[PDB]
Amino acid sequence: EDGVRKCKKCEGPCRKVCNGIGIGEFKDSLSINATNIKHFKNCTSISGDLHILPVAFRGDSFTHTPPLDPQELDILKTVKEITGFLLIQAWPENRTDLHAFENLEIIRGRTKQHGQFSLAVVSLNITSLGLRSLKEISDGDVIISGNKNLCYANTINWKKLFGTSGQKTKIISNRGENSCKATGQVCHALCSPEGCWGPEPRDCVSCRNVSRGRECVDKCNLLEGEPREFVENSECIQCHPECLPQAMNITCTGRGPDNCIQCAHYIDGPHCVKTCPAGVMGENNTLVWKYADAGHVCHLCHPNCTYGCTGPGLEGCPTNG
Ligand SMILES: *[C@@H]1O[C@H](CO[C@@H]2O[C@@H](C)[C@@H](O)[C@@H](O)[C@@H]2O)[C@@H](O)[C@H](O)[C@H]1NC(C)=O
Ligand SMILES: *[C@@H]1O[C@H](CO)[C@@H](O)[C@H](O)[C@H]1NC(C)=O
Ligand SMILES: *[C@@H]1O[C@H](CO)[C@@H](O)[C@H](O)[C@H]1NC(C)=O
């Protein structure tokens, strides 16, 4: 079970806040060129505005700045929050989606491009967006234009991502819905009609049937197979290992050990245990000992037999060394 959300702190070391292009250390910097991209490494929140103009990839000779290698973009795969706006005006052809932003989830929109835009994806040689993680575009309007071979962008119900009232969404002159559907570049079957960031089941706004981890799936593993799961708000989560997987019925009502049908080993109180407690330091700083009934029910053993137990009460306890 992936019961722990972040695992160790939040990532490897953990969360860092960096300034945006044209603000702070990147003052008087027009775009994210091959000079300041290295200062965005190990950074979860990039407060401010991000800019990727053609100058970054071409290289500006007069500012002693070099051309950007498309493999450097992966330095932004750690960014998930943008307090200002994201302005992407140029991106390579060897990549069909916004590869570097595969983990961006929240874009606030305090700062806006021309006081109107939060997301600007214009003139890009891509075929899909691939912003699978983006859940909220808080304020600014969205512009997606001049992306000749780009499909799937018109599918997204931007109303779900929007927060502020009247958020306009200029999605014009891309790869028409006529050609997109005729070539099989439509939203996935497992993907709900609420739009998708591409064809892959992971690229999805919401799931039509259910989800599991980072994918839209049809089955939830309730009645059979790999770890028996239960459905909670369109999500598949496996029942506690100490729950005998039942056929004809679902293995659990919830997440915990005490929320399942029947324990595969013994049963201490409401909890399903692999063995009855045999000398555990109890919450009252004292060793707790128990025994197993005929029906596998853990009962507290007699106080007299302290360093061990076999049956009920004060019966059988002197062992031969
Ligand atoms: C969505 O799921 C449909 C089946 O129904 C659902 O799944 C079964 C296993 C049961 O849990 C049932 O109670 C659910 O309502 C499929 O027929 C359908 O093909 C699925 N959709 C797609 C796009 O695959
Ligand atoms: C970035 O994080 C990785 C772990 O994900 C760590 O090994 C590395 O040293 C970090 N780099 C810097 C410059 O902090
Ligand atoms: C499954 O267990 C629940 C809980 O007691 C019960 O209400 C239901 O009738 C059972 N269904 C089957 C098919 O065993």
Task: Indicate if 171 and 290 belong to the same structural domain.
Answer: no
Cβ atoms 127, 97 nearer than 8 A: yes
Of 126, 151, 182, which residue is a domain's last?
A: 182
Q: Which ligand 3 atom minimizes the distance to the CA of 250?
A: 1
Total count of domains within the chain: 2
For residue 211, count CB atoms less than 10 angstroms from its CB and return exposed for 0-12, middle for 13-18, buried for 19 or more. buried
Last residue of a domain, one of 182, 217, 238: 182
Which residues constitute the domain of residue 288?
A: 275-321
Q: Report in angstroms the alpha-carbon separations of 272 from 201, 239, 260, 277.
A: 36, 11, 8, 12
> Does residue 246 lie within any of the structural domains?
no
Domain shared by 291 and 174, yes or no:
no
Q: How far apart are the first and last CA of the chain?
A: 42
Is residue 218 in a domain?
no
What is the Å distance from ligand 1's center to 248 Cα?
A: 17
Report if residue 6 sits inside a domain: no
CA distance 119 to 115: 12
Ligand that lies nearest to the alpha carbon of residue 10, given by its number in the listed order: 2
Is 59 inside a domain boundary?
yes
- Residue 290, judged by CB atoms within 10 A of its CB (0-12, 13-18, 19+), counts as buried
- The 10 Å Cβ neighbour count of residue 230 is 20
Task: Answer yes or no: is 30 within a domain.
Answer: yes
In testing the pocket of ligand 1, which one of 188, 196, 206, 218 has its CB within 8 Å of the most ligand atoms?
A: 218
Helix (H) or strand (E) holding 161: helix 158-161
CA of 271 to the centre of ligand 3 (A): 19
Cα–Cα distance between 142 and 10 in angstroms, integer? 30
Residue nearest to atom 5 of ligand 2 (CA): 12
> Exposed, middle or buried: residue 269 (CB in 10 Å: 0-12, 13-18, 19+)?
exposed
Residues whose CB falls within 8 Å of the CB of residue 4, separated by 6 or more in sequence, listed in order: none
Q: Nearest to residue 125, comparing CAs of 177, 156, 88, 161? A: 88
Q: Do 29 and 164 reside in the same domain of the chain? A: yes
Using alpha carbons only, how large is the chain's radius of gyration in Å?
28
- Experimental resolution (Å): 3.3
Residues framing ligand 3 (Cβ under 6 A): 248-249
DSSP string, 197-256: SSSSTTS-SSBSSEE-SSSEES---SSSSSS-EEESSSBEEEPPTTS---SSS-SBSSSS
Asked if residue 223 belongs to a domain, the reply is no
Helix or strand or coil: residue 290?
strand
Residue 175 is part of a domain; what is its CATH number? 3.80.20.20
Is 4 among the domain residues?
A: no
Query: How many angstroms is it from 43 CA to the middle of ligand 2?
Result: 10
Question: Do residues 143 and 282 both lie within one domain?
Answer: no
Q: What phi, psi does 54 have (nearest 5°)? A: -60, -20
> Is 196 inside a domain boundary?
no
Last residue of one domain, picked from the residues 166, 182, 198: 182
DSSP string, 72-129: GGGGGTT--EESS-EEE----SS-SS-GGGTT--EE--SS-BTTTEEEEEES---S--
* Sheet with 86-88: strands ordered across: 50-52, 86-88, 117-122, 141-145, 169-172
Please state how this structure was obtained.
X-ray
Residues 175 and 297 in one domain: no
Element (H, E) at 159: helix 158-161
- Helix, strand and coil content of the chain, in percent to the nearest 5, comes to 10, 20, 70
Task: Count CB atoms within 10 A of the CB of residue 132.
Answer: 22
Dist. CA 233 → ligand 2 center (Å): 35
Atom of ligand 2 nearest to the CA of 42: 1
Residue 121, CA distances (Å) to 51, 83, 126, 215 in order: 11, 17, 10, 25
The CATH number linked to 288 is: 2.10.220.10
Q: Are residues 176 and 282 in the same domain?
A: no
